[model samples]
Structure formats: C-alpha cells, structure tokens
Target chain A: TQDCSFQHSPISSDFAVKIRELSDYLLQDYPVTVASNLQDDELCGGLWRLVLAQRWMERLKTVAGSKMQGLLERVNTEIHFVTKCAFQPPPSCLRFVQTNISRLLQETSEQLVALKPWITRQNFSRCLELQCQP
Target chain B: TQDCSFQHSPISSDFAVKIRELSDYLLQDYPVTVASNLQDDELCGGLWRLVLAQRWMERLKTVAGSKMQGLLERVNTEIHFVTKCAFQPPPSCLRFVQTNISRLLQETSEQLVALKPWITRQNFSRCLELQCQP
Candidate 1:
C-alpha cells in the first residue's frame, strides 16, 4: 500500500488561507452588489458558474490529498449557503454584473490551476495507470 | 401590444454561422486529441464545462430571438453527443488538455459576449421589466 501521506507537505498552509479569503470575498462581500435589476436567467447563470468553480475546488481537494481539506470544505459550505440567497441585479447593471462575475470566476480558476504543481507531485501518474487498467 | 419584431434585424446571419462553426470545431475536431490517459474526474470536469458553454448558447438563444434559433439548436445538439463520448488523454498530457479545454471554453465565452451588442438591441430591458412585475 502506498503510504501517500507526506511528513513535510509541499502545499503551504498559506495557500489554503488565501483560498479561504477569496471564498469569503465571493460568498460574503460579492452578493452585496446583487440587486433585483438583472434578469433572473442572467443572475442565476452567474451564480451557477460560481458554484461550478466551487465544485472544481472540491475536485482538486480530492486528487491533491488531505492537506487542504479543511479550508476547501469551509469554502464549499459557505458557497452553498451564499448561492441559496436571492440575487437580483439592476437591469441597467446587467452587463456590469455579468462582467464582474466572469472576472471572479476566472480568478478562481487561476487559483485552482496554481495548485497543479502540488497535485502533480502527489503521483497522479500512478492514479491514471490504475484508472486505465482493465 | 409591443411588436418587438424588427423589419431589418441588426444581427447578421454571419454571426449565427460563426457560432455553428465554433460549435462544430469543439464537438468534432477537439475530441480527436482525447486519449485514454487522463483521469476520469479531470476529463469529465472539462467536458462538463463545455456542456455549460453549450447551455449558455441556449440561454442566449432564448433572449436573442428566432433568427439564431436553428443554428443554436444545431450547436446544442452536436455538443450533447460530443460530451457523451469517452475522452482519455495521456497521463503526461493532463495539464495540456486542461489548458486547451480552458482556452476553448474561454474562446466560447468570448463569442457569447460578442453577441452582447446584438442581444442588447433586442430590447432586453422590456423583458426584464416583465420579469420583475409582481
């Protein structure tokens, strides 16, 4: 059995803290700008993409191991409640809201990509080999 | 009753053709690079995002009217089956697949955004007003 656990983990706790900070910004601070001016479909789509971003983090946590599990769990939990709240942006501000949401989602994707080095170090090659076996 | 239909539509047929072309590239050409090497989760996640992009086109079709309907429907139909097909990239090429998928998704988003001016011309303000009514 491969003892996959590492005594000195390459992933920094600071990275996890940074992720929490970003998640907090998204969940708590971002929604303040949400008003009932934008169309239901547009607002809901933006929020849904954010939820997808959260899911991406969860996937990364699964593959990258347990070092950042706590932070990612908290991120997912907070995002869950935040998305449940109502969001209505002004019609005049639809483009603005859409642009900002896209920007934020892109930033979140970037952070996930940033963790690739650590994820790679965890021997994903072996994981893939097992998956490809009949 | 507001006759929202236009005698001379601002949106060009070329735009619809472009969307159809891009969708075809994603559905037909892109999958050839897919091999049985990447992890299931990663591959599925990328495909899921492309599906999300297809859904975005559907949402745009709803707001943008019947002129683009045929093309968008074709786009969605093709994307649906393409995503269902198995995708397995080389283990060593996981990052490359992820990056290219991201780039394609981003290009898809840009194309959607490019439709904004035409969408805005279709009197979305009125649509929002009706939706916001108690």
Candidate 2:
C-alpha cells in the first residue's frame, strides 16, 4: 500500500513525514530500474542504521581522556540509557558469527583433558599362563 | 531521480502541526514557557530502526523466553538480517531474509564446531567419528 498511515504509534508525524520525504527522494534519484535492484532499500536502511551508530561512535571517540577505565563505567551506563529506547541488536558481530561460544567452551574443556590410551590387552591371561608354567 | 527535498520535511506544515503536539499542551504551554523538543529528520531515521528492530525483537521474543535466549536470537537476527539485506533487499518489518536453508544450517554447524580450538583442525573428522563410532 502506498498509504503510510500506521496505527498504534508512539512515533510522531514529524518522523513519518521525514521518512516520506526521504523515500520520495530515493525513488526519484535511486528508482528501482533493475529487476534485481536491492540497493535502494539497502542504502536507505544502511543510512538509517548509520545515523544511530555514528552518534554512539562519535560519543565514544570524544568522551575519552586516554585511559577509558573511569570513563568506561560512565559510558556503559549512558550507552544503556541511550540505547534503552533504541534498538537491541543481536550478536551479528563477525566475532560472534565465527565463534559459537557454546561449542567452543565444550571443545576447549575436552582438549584440556588427558586420556590414557589402552593398548596391551589386560595381561590377566599372560599372568595366568606364567603362573601355570611356574 | 537522485535527490530529495529534505529541508522541508521536519519543518513542513504537517510536521509543524504535529510538532506542536507535545500532548498538545507542552508546546501549547503547560506553563506557557518551555518549548517542547521535537523529532527531526535525523530523529526520523531513529524511528525507522525502532519500528523494524522492535518488530523483529517482538517476533523472536514471542517464540522464546529467558533473557539470554530472547537476547541472542533477536539481536543476532537484526545484525545478520541487516548484513544480508545490505547485499540484497526488501527491508522493513514485514520482511524475511532466507533462501539457502541446508547450506546455511551446515555452515552454521561448521562455525559452531570450528570454535573448539585443536578440535577445529579435526572438526569434520570428529564429526564423522561420532556418527560411525557406534
């Protein structure tokens, strides 16, 4: 539907109006011409994400006095409040993707274990044979 | 097709009217003094992610419980989905990003296994051993 009127919103029309403005600009300038043109929405979404990401990145960059040790606690708390009403993102960081924490812990424990290999079958029979010979 | 008139957005008559609506009183002067803050084009972008991220968080939250489980799924979904859409499209609340099912699952499994340090070297080998050991 071309209609953007959404219901049950905590958002003000100011935001919606801006989105509509951006969408119009995007369509005219980055109109979907290719049947496989995914760039428009992607760029639109990316720029949107960047806006918030940038604010945080900017804050962190300028908030420090070298050792962020004291600043970390304050930053952490503020980040909580700032992002509180913002988005809660999943572990999409490349590190999380490459390292499945659950399996990593299990395998690490197993590797730390030492196992005694069993090779020469129990010598019970040999002992009995020797006993009989004696 | 490449540009949009963004200046008028947060300042438009519509937003101007809406912006004046801080409970329709704060701006109207609850005390007739403090000017109410308003959402601008920049803030508008914030709401977009809010809508999309909250919707996704709700979906995953509905499916599972627990802070860890609730957190891990939705947050991961947001990042992973965004990255996927970055290379593709059709973003928004009513969207999904999935195509290669088995390959995705297998790759996911491999990632989990490869997290195990020394076992990462013999991940496939140990995986095969587990299946054939019986």
Candidate 3:
C-alpha cells in the first residue's frame, strides 16, 4: 500500500527533477577518459562507480559463460588501464573530477557502457561477440 | 521472427506431455528420508537435486544480511544433518535410490522443504527463527 501512489507515478516530482538533471548531464558530457582503477579524484563518484562496476562484473563472470566472461574481462582491462596502467582518467574523466563539483548525480560511464545496447540490440550483441570471441 | 508463433503460446503442445508427468510426480511424493549426501539408488535424481539445492542456498546466505544469514545457517545445518552428519540420508534418502529408477523427476525433498512457505510464510519464518536460536 505504501507503494501504491508511487506505482501509479513511478517517479516522484522531487526525484524527477534530479533524474532530468542527471540524464541531461549524462547526455551531454560523456566520452570521458584517462586511466585505471584508482580515480584521479577528477572522475567523481559517478565515474568512479563506473570503474567499480568491474568488481561486480568480475563476480558475474565467475557464474557466466564464455561470451560474458570475455566481456567482463575487457571491462576490467579498460578500467585497469584508466586507473593503473595509464594512471589517470585521460583528459575527460580527470578534469572536473579534480577541480569542479557539478556532475553530482550523473549516471556512471560504465552504466552508460552497459546501456549502449538500448540504441540497437544487434549492435550490442555484435559488440559482445566481437569483444568476447563468442 | 518465427518465435512470434511460440511467443503468444509459450507452453507448446509438444512439451505438455512432460509437464503433466512432472506435476503428477510432484503431487504424489510426500515425505522421504534416510541420510547424508549420496543417494541410495532408492532415492531418485529428484531427491538428490534436493540435496544439491544446498549449494545455491549456501551461496545466497553468503551475501545476505544478519537475519537471512542466520536462517541460511540453520538451513545449512539441517542439510548437513540430512547429508553429512550421519554420513547418509539416515532413513529417508538411502533406501531405494540404489536399486530403483522410477522416481526420475519428482521435486527433490529439499526443494519441497523450500516450498513449505506456500502453506504459511509465518510458520516458515518462525521455524527458521526457532531453529536458528537453538
């Protein structure tokens, strides 16, 4: 019963505003980069979440088949490059994450990576097949 | 696109025969016992499956909060009693599993134990709580 009103209207107004702001932020300032695991402090929480996603994805790989195994592995490799190998979030993920404070509620870059499939499932499957060798 | 035919009607007629046989088998088997992990050919594959249900539920307990953690612990203990404690399925599990083969797909007794919640979630919760305390 507590969920009834929310059921009819999935997004509350206060939260809706935040969602729009976050969505707009995600829509605009994407394609961030630099390097691996440890955030440059420039990546902020959201971007850092993207990098941390590797942990759970790695756990998922423990249970999944070859296709997902390869996909998660590449994600781990890419994130490691940004954090460990390259040692910074290229120019994009590092810049504001260090000095600025505006991108508070934006969706994570890793989440965005996960969502590209919404554009086209075929492309998503192709990407997986291409990346994973399945 | 041909999935459209099956999509509207998911339970295909070809597979219906298997379902009836399965449901009947599940309906007939009541309580069963004996001991430990190894099935006594007297207990069929279905009952053995019940024993193996321990693995996934154990995995689930590993991630849950304290309350669920305790419940899963008891479930583990009970399963141990049924499987490893006496080092046999006591009286229920070992009997005909060794020689018989008809009980190919009855729902495992372990899964049936899990299903007890349908009759009453309260009792299930209370049983878990009670067993967990002692």
Q: For model 3, what is the alpha-carbon lDDT of residue B121? A: 22
lDDT of 2 by residue, B87-121 (tens): 21212322333322122222333332232232212
Clashes of each: 10, 6, 37
Cα displacement (Å) at residue A37, model 2: 41
What class would a CAPRI assessor give candidate 3's docking?
incorrect
Model 3 segments more than 4 A misplaced: A1-39, A43-47, A50-134, B1-42, B55-63, B74-81, B88-134
Model 1 C-alpha lDDT per residue in residues A1-134, reported as the tens digit of each score: 33222234333434444554433322111111222242334223334344345555555345221323444565555344223333222233333232332245445445434542443244222221111111
What residue pairs are clashing in model 2?
Answer: A28-B1, A29-B1, A29-B2, A89-B75, A90-B75, A90-B76
State in Å the error of residue A87, model 1: 15
Q: Which ranges in model 1 have alpha carbons more than 4 Å from their true place?
A: A1-41, A82-134, B1-134
Question: DockQ rank, highest first?
Answer: 2, 1, 3
DockQ score for candidate 1? 0.01
Q: Please give each candidate's TM-score.
A: 0.21, 0.18, 0.24
DockQ of each: 0.01, 0.01, 0.01
- Residue A7 Cα positional deviation in candidate 1, in Å, after optimal superposition: 44
lDDT of 3 by residue, B94-131 (tens): 32232111132233333444433332222111121111
Give one digit per residue, the lDDT tens place, for model 3 in A1-134.
11101112111224324323323212122122322333323223333444444333355345333432444354344333223212122333323222111132233343344433332222111111111000
Cα lDDT of model 2 overall?
Answer: 0.24
